[PDB]
Design a protein. Structure first.
Lengths: 40, 378, 171, 36, 447, 54
């Protein structure tokens, strides 16, 4: 349906919220977290 | 017929992500390639693995053995019609052609199944063919084959109270959902923990128990949780041989907070090298974290994170930014605070949102009724 | 279509846009942006410099007024950058000022410089104390002190009356 | 040429007629409800 | 062997649809049209879909006494253009069946739009619409016989004014057609309201945000609301155009509700990217709010080739990276300048700071100033007091600065419990509900 | 309070530990359970509504 302007113009995908939350935040998810308890 | 072959799928996953060993794909993959007449498991791994030093000749003898099997099949197709019986062509080639499916992934499958499906004198004759699709649908994560054969099993294989290979259907759907994004289907359909007792997906029955606990720690409310994985004595043995699993369970019911990260680290490192868990291994972490933090917020309204710090071991700024991200997720409402530093919880969802949900339906719901009352007079 | 390069265009649009923001017309600011999307990409630097100023006022400027007044020293923009120094605001005077906060000097607000001449004394006593009734900012109201009643329970009761009327009109 | 097309505009008027006829039918409904 | 089938069913197109429309339009007023006469939209878009052809149905049109049975059957039988589109006037002037004038001045003429030769017949379509606009003008000077142009041919007329649009666009713009439109408005203002003005007003905004910019303020004095919104499609994209306006008028909190409304009033299908491409620039206003969720709840993978900038852009929104900011700008700023996107590049930083202050504000009762100066990529404590005042900027949640040295003495705000604010609004909630009861009353009034 | 309950919310600074709730509120619950299926009916009828016309 040509609306007179617009003709001119769950695999891995629900997780995308968690992943874009976790892009540069806890990128390993455990490999610091399992090793936090001996930092202090 | 399928236990080392599902172990080949385990090896597909096992040399999918890591490269810490570049010679398992010769050790137990050539040990697989010499058994089961595994031809395609090296013929497709011939490109994604190494140069395969000279791996044609020791495989020439086995593709020649396959040629012997195939040529006695090609004689058998007219040797069985001289046998004056019913469908002995179909029998005598369906046997070694399901074996061709055991040899080759799709070719023996396609050349077999569209002939040996032509008469269906039993739903086993359908469902063994369905199984021989389900093996390759676990090997190659298909969708069309290994949901439409389940549609066919949900066409006529409802009949017959045989219950073994009808619970197999439940197990395969549980495996298929937990193979993608499952919350509840694997818990509901892995209810049948004890009552399976032998399969090929049961190549380690105790790992099936790991599967049902790794989904029933998510999809299961705490009364249901104690009723299933505590008041289940029939599951108590196979969780009882697994220490850290049972440790995480009885601590998670016990609210033993400082071992939660230990046990979660155990389960997460197990999550690394176990297949059908690549869409899951990062989601599961925060899932079980916020799942413990549910009753951790149910605990108090008067709460500091120093108490949380010596409840966890290190969480001060870690859990500050972490619970900040959980609030940013929308769930877990509490006011973490600067120097006053009182983690204050709320009251449940009665107040006005119980009032509000009805018209939150009747915004778009009633837009549906508005515009579809505007359907009548153009 | 054959209008040649008129170099007065850049700074006359600059003065237009300058006073246009000085009278707080951001809708008119962006209608100016949208009537010329072409030259305002990289050229027209005396429009491209007011849109860096729009980044600075996108930031909600009190520091960046001085931090952008640093780089307009001589173009005879003076009459209208004076109106920009007028249109710098007074919300901190509307929250905590009015004879004492010792000085609010370290935020680059143009008015809030000049420690105590009669210029900012006049401004701290300008036309009163911008809030109005019942309180000063010597001891702040923290907004305005409305906090009236639930007398509007009675006019929502009036809403109930004509609501029942509209029920009767509906049946 | 005002006094030509107002007559046409008098069919907005006629919309009240259909509603009139149909609520007369609505009364005719209740007429044998009350007779029952 | 296929073309003898539209000789049957393309004949029965005009037989059933057009014959029933004209004959049932000759009486039974306002059931004259609009029960299958304005099946016109999809049955005649379908006529331009369902099926030499160009001269055949345009010869020998106006004959006599109503022998269109034989004449349309001649149009059937003849399957085995310079005066030709004017031949419905060149056989004789039409002289009878004034509901058929625009009908046969639309349905045979318009398939050249779908034939797409664009060179010799768009000026002939211009002439054919000079004839049809002569009908449009001469309906009130020479046709003082009955209504026949409101009740049927106004709903036909707005459609063929969209076809006017389809013709006028493919070569140039239109300016005379705008005063011509407002004359069409004056002969539809007080007598019988048509959309019409809203059709070429959608086109007005559509070509004007390309090329003229004074006219939103002229809409402001021109906002005859037209609450009929019968199609809801024209009204939907009307909200889309004016939501692009309020996005370029920088009105955002209105834009989110009115553009979510404009989306949820699209019942549309055909996932080529109509709803998707309109919806992307719709929720650009949510990119301008300062708040936007993850767009996984919005994507159709047919839009994926166009949103190859957009997902990384909303990643830049949820993050605050200036590298990602400028990189998405220069690299991935293509294909959106055709729609107009560069008003988010000035205030993507504002989006960053409002997302951050939303997270921190609902996260923290009290925060400190010289650590909220280091939550995000802030600059200084004077920049942080600055951005606390700019974080209020409208009336946000209580943040009093502890005005000695305690940085901020902010706390959370209360009294949304269940007390007076919901029952302050429930009068208006049930005001909306009684408006729907008025919709029930008019549901009874539909017969 | 954690695992089990008698709905005693932590009332640290009062001196009673008030044990209170109103479990019958279920008119609102029941109306929600109505709406969920009322428009399942309406959506099932919409097939007839948008089918028998065109």
């Amino acid at each position: 349906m040509s609306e007179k302007k617009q003709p001119v113009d769950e695999d891995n995908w629900d997780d995308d919220n968690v992943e874009d939350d976790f892009s540069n935040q806890l990128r390993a998810e455990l490999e610091k977290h399992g090793y936090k308890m001996e930092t202090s | 017929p399928k236990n080392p072959d599902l172990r080949i799928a385990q090896l597909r996953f096992l040399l999918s992500l890591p490269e810490h060993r570049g010679d398992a794909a010769v050790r137990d993959e050539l040990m697989a390639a010499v058994r089961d007449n595994n031809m395609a498991p090296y013929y497709e791994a011939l490109c994604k693995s190494l140069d395969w030093q000279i791996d044609v000749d020791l495989l020439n003898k086995m593709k020649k053995a396959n040629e012997d099997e195939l040529k006695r099949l090609d004689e058998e197709l007219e040797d069985a019609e001289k046998n004056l019986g019913e469908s002995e062509i179909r029998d005598a080639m369906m046997a070694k052609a399901e074996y061709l499916c055991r040899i080759g992934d799709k070719e023996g499958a396609l050349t077999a199944f569209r002939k040996t499906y032509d008469k269906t004198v039993a739903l086993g004759h359908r469902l063994d063919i369905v199984f021989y699709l389900l093996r390759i649908g676990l090997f190659y994560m298909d969708n069309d084959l290994i949901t439409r054969n389940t549609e066919k099993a949900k066409s006529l294989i409802e009949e017959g109270g045989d219950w073994d290979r009808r619970n197999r259907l439940k197990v395969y759907q549980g495996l298929y959902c937990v193979a993608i994004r499952d919350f509840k289907q694997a818990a509901e359909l892995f209810l049948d923990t004890v009552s399976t007792f032998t399969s090929y997906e049961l190549m380690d029955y105790k790992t099936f128990v790991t599967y049902t606990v790794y989904v029933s720690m998510i999809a299961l409310e705490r009364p249901d949780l104690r009723e299933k994985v505590i008041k289940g004595a029939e599951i108590l043995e196979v969780l009882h041989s697994l220490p850290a699993v049972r440790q995480y369970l009885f601590s998670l019911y016990e609210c033993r907070y400082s071992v939660f990260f230990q046990s979660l680290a155990v389960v997460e490192q197990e999550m690394k090298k176990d297949w059908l868990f690549a869409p899951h291994y990062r989601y599961y972490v925060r899932e079980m974290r916020i799942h413990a933090y549910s009753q951790l917020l149910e605990s108090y309204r008067s709460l500091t994170l120093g108490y949380m710090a010596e409840a966890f071991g290190v969480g001060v700024e870690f859990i500050d930014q972490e619970l900040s991200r959980f609030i940013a997720a929308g769930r877990l409402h509490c006011k973490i605070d600067k120097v006053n530093e009182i983690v204050e919880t709320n009251r449940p969802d009665s107040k006005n949102w119980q009032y509000q949900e009805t018209i939150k339906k009747g915004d778009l719901l009633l837009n549906r009724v508005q515009k579809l009352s505007r359907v009548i007079n153009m | 279509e054959q209008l040649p390069e008129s170099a007065y265009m850049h700074q006359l649009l600059g003065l237009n846009l300058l006073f246009l923001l000085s009278q707080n017309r951001v809708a008119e600011f962006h209608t100016e942006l949208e009537r010329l999307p072409a030259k305002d990409i990289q050229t027209n630097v005396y429009i491209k410099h007011p849109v860096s100023l729009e980044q600075y006022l996108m930031e909600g400027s009190y520091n960046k007024v001085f931090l952008a007044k640093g780089n307009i020293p001589a173009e005879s923009y003076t009459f209208f950058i004076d109106i920009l120094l007028d249109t710098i605001r007074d919300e901190i005077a509307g929250c905590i000022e009015k004879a004492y906060e010792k000085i609010l000097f370290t935020e680059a607000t143009r008015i809030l410089f000049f420690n105590t001449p009669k210029k900012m004394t006049d401004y701290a006593k300008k036309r009163g104390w911008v809030l109005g009734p019942n309180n000063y900012y010597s001891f702040a109201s923290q907004q305005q002190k409305p906090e009236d009643t639930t007398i509007p329970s009675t006019e929502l009761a009036k809403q109930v009356i004509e609501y029942a009327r509209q029920l009767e009109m509906i049946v | 040429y005002l006094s030509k097309i107002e007559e046409l505009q008098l069919i907005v008027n006629d919309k009240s007629q259909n509603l009139r006829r149909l609520q007369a039918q609505r009364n005719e409904l209740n007429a044998k409800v009350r007779l029952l | 062997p296929p073309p003898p089938a539209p000789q049957d069913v393309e004949m029965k197109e005009e037989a059933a649809t057009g014959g029933g429309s004209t004959g049932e339009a000759d009486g039974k007023t306002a059931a004259a049209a609009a029960e299958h006469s304005q099946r016109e939209l999809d049955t005649v878009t379908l006529e331009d879909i369902k099926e030499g052809k160009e001269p055949r149905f345009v010869l020998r049109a106006l004959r006599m006494l109503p022998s269109t049975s034989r004449r349309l059957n001649h149009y059937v039988l003849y399957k085995a253009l310079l005066p030709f589109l004017e031949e419905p006037m060149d056989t004789e002037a039409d002289l009878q069946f004034r509901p058929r004038t625009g009908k046969a001045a639309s349905t045979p003429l318009l398939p050249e739009v779908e034939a797409y030769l664009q060179l010799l017949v768009v000026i002939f379509m211009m002439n054919s619409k000079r004839y049809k606009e002569a009908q449009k003008i001469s309906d009130d000077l020479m046709q003082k016989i009955s209504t026949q142009n409101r009740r049927a041919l106004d709903l036909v007329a707005a459609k063929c004014y969209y076809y006017h649009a389809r013709v006028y666009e493919f070569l140039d713009k239109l300016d005379v057609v705008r005063s011509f439109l407002h004359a069409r408005l004056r002969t539809a203002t007080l007598r019988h309201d048509a959309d019409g003005q809203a059709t070429l007003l959608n086109l007005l905004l559509r070509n004007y945000l390309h090329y003229s910019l004074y006219d939103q303020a002229e809409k402001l004095v021109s906002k005859s609301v037209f609450p009929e919104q019968a199609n809801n499609n024209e009204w939907a994209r009307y909200l889309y155009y004016t939501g692009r306006i309020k996005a370029i008028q920088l009105e955002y909190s209105e834009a989110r509700r009115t553009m979510t409304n404009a989306l949820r009033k699209a019942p549309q299908h055909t996932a080529v990217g109509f709803k998707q491409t309109v919806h992307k620039l719709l929720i650009v206003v949510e990119l301008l709010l300062g708040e936007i969720p993850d767009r996984l709840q919005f994507r159709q993978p047919s839009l994926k080739r166009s949103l190859m900038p957009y997902f990384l852009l909303t990643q830049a929104v949820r993050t605050g990276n200036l590298a990602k900011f400028n990189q998405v700008l220069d690299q991935f700023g293509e294909k959106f300048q055709a729609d107009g996107t560069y008003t988010l590049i000035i205030r993507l930083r504002h989006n960053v700071i409002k997302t951050g202050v939303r997270m921190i504000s609902l996260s923290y009762s009290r925060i400190s100033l010289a650590d909220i100066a280091q939550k995000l990529q802030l600059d200084s404590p004077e920049d942080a007091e600055f951005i606390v005042a700019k974080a209020i900027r409208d009336g946000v949640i209580e943040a009093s600065i502890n005005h000695e040295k305690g940085y901020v003495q902010s706390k959370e705000m209360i009294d949304i419990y269940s007390t007076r604010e919901p029952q302050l609004a429930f009068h208006q909630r049930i005001s909306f509900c009684l408006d729907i009861h008025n919709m029930s009353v008019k549901a009874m009034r539909f017969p | 309070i954690l695992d089990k309950k008698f709905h005693g919310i932590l009332d640290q600074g009062e001196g009673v530990l008030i044990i209170f709730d109103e479990p019958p509120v279920d008119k609102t619950y029941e109306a929600a359970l109505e709406t969920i299926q009322n428009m399942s009916k309406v959506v099932d009828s919409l097939y007839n509504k948008a089918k028998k016309l065109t």
